Amino acid sequence: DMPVERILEAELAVEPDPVTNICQAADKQLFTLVEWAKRIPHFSELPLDDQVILLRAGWNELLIASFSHRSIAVKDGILLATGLHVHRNSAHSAGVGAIFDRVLTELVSKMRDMQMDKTELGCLRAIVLFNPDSKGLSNPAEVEALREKVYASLEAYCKHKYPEQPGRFAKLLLRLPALRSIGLKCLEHLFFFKLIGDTPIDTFLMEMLEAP
Amino acid sequence: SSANEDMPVERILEAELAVEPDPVTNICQAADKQLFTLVEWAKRIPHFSELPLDDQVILLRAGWNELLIASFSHRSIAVKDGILLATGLHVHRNSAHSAGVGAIFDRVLTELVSKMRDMQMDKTELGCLRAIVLFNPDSKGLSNPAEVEALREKVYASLEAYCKHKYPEQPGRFAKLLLRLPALRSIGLKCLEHLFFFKLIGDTPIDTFLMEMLEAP
Ligand SMILES: CC1=C(/C=C/C(C)=C\C=C\C(C)=C\C(=O)O)C(C)(C)CCC1
Numbered sequence A: 001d002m003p004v005e006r007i008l009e010a011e012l013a014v015e016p017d018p019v020t021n022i023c024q025a026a027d028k029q030l031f032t033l034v035e036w037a038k039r040i041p042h043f044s045e046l047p048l049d050d051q052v053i054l055l056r057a058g059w060n061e062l063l064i065a066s067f068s069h070r071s072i073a074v075k076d077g078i079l080l081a082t083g084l085h086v087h088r089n090s091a092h093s094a095g096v097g098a099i100f101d102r103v104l105t106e107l108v109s110k111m112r113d114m115q116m117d118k119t120e121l122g123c124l125r126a127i128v129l130f131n132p133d134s135k136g137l138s139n140p141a142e143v144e145a146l147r148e149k150v151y152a153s154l155e156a157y158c159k160h161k162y163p164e165q166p167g168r169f170a171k172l173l174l175r176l177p178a179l180r181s182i183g184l185k186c187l188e189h190l191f192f193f194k195l196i197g198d199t200p201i202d203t204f205l206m207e208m209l210e211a212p
Numbered sequence B: 001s002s003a004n005e006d007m008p009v010e011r012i013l014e015a016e017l018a019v020e021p022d023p024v025t026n027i028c029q030a031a032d033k034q035l036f037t038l039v040e041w042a043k044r045i046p047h048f049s050e051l052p053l054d055d056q057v058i059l060l061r062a063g064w065n066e067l068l069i070a071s072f073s074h075r076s077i078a079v080k081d082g083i084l085l086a087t088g089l090h091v092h093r094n095s096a097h098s099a100g101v102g103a104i105f106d107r108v109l110t111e112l113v114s115k116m117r118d119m120q121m122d123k124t125e126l127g128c129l130r131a132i133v134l135f136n137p138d139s140k141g142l143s144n145p146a147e148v149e150a151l152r153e154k155v156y157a158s159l160e161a162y163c164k165h166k167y168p169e170q171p172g173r174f175a176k177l178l179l180r181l182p183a184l185r186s187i188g189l190k191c192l193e194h195l196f197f198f199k200l201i202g203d204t205p206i207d208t209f210l211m212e213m214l215e216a217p
């Protein structure tokens, strides 16, 4: 009904050429994803092979959710975990303005235009993490159960805090479709970079693109 | 097995539909646009994703140009003496000749556009020819070319199986479809030459990923 502060705890523990910088910030946080998920109620009690499968599945959406929320503070830019700011002016000149602008309007803006609080960002991340449809899962039913628990606990949280908005929870969940979509597109750009010879051979991101 | 279960043509048609939207500058900008979508296109072709990432990239670096030419050629069946770019523009041969690329342009119109228009190639067929062009087991660098060859064979089977079921009174449609491959291969090599040439004479298209594909692996 409410392991919520454990989830916020997880989020606070992990965290502080334009493409090259974004990818290096990504490498940095991809690693912390291990410590982040381990601090998530019940995640550690799942078979090792399942924990790895869940992270290989949502790692990109998970990282995009995090830096997007961190960026609510600025405008027309994003704040990397390496302490750098990247302006959309730079995204465009480098060739990625389209997906960049999609991140700014469908994620950064929607979270700033409703004041998303870290505890909700942490919960959406946990819902993204507990995707029972991931291929290869030992017990997809237990994972599904865990997702449901984040749903319950999260809705329960929106009530205790924002009762004068008998909908908020539904508004939070509206970010999921965009994240899923933006996330798939980023994997494409990543493949693309390797396709055209400007592959970032110095990160671990490209290993995450391999087929399971 | 069943030819079509090992390589379903509805999945292949699906791939194609997901990606369907100075003359030279315009053609090159349409090319950049679709070069990118090639990533999403190939990811939807049955089994392409199950290959080692390095192989997927090698297959695309090898046939990207033939793959794009096949697509805009088919799209152009709709007009006469011109081609329809993915950016929504139409380019007439007259402008192509004024620019000095009327020779290859006419080759595309007669050896590809016309042949497809006349035999009424359908999107599923165009998609299968593209998949055959993609699974090229002779691409240098391949880690397991035997698996790629196997996949090509599956598209062949599945595609022949499709012509026989859909056009039962055209026994030689499959062989006729495959006749487009040699022209595509040939037209495709010539376009790489023109692309190099543009850079050679100082008319290199500014900021396009097109030029990046010309680098040697
Ligand atoms: C949005 C985006 C991209 C994808 C990024 C991914 C998958 C993760 C970034 C994580 C960071 C930057 C984390 C941190 O600083 O918290 C690419 C490379 C295609 C370039 C264009 C913009």
Ligand SMILES: CC1=C(/C=C/C(C)=C\C=C\C(C)=C\C(=O)O)C(C)(C)CCC1
Pocket: B024, B027, B028, B030, B031, B034, B065, B068, B069, B071, B072, B084, B085, B086, B087, B101, B104, B105, B108, B191, B192, B194, B195
């Ligand atoms: C045929 C042709 C050329 C090559 C084009 C290539 C390699 C790709 C085009 C893709 C498009 C135009 C895609 C789309 O709109 O679907 C060049 C530049 C030598 C100019 C003369 C005519």
